């Protein structure tokens, strides 16, 4: 599932919809959650 885990970052940073694969293990989900966080806190700041 390496390809899906590679697509996930690009599909969560570029606001796209390409690729439908989500983390399954709980121990790796929480990290991915804050990943989404980082997304906003960069792009919005850029616009500002």
């Amino acid at each position: 599932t390496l390809s899906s885990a590679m697509w996930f970052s690009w599909g969560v940073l570029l606001n796209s919809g390409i690729g439908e694969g989500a983390p399954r293990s709980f121990s790796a989900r929480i990290l991915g959650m804050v990943w989404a966080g980082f997304a906003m806190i960069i792009v919005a700041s850029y616009t500002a």
Binding site: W10, G11, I18
Partner: protein, 44 residues
């Protein structure tokens, strides 16, 4: 099942704060291209 009209719908929705469900492509090259288009839309 990917026509030449069901792609303008996806790209228009994507350029316009993607909210409506559409049908994504399947080829890798099309994936990278729609990703580039997403970058364009966010910058614009």
């Amino acid at each position: 099942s990917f026509t030449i009209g069901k792609a303008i719908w996806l790209l228009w929705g994507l350029v316009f704060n993607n909210s409506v469900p559409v049908q994504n492509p399947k080829g890798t090259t099309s994936k990278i291209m729609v990703s580039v288009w997403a970058f364009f839309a966010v910058i614009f």
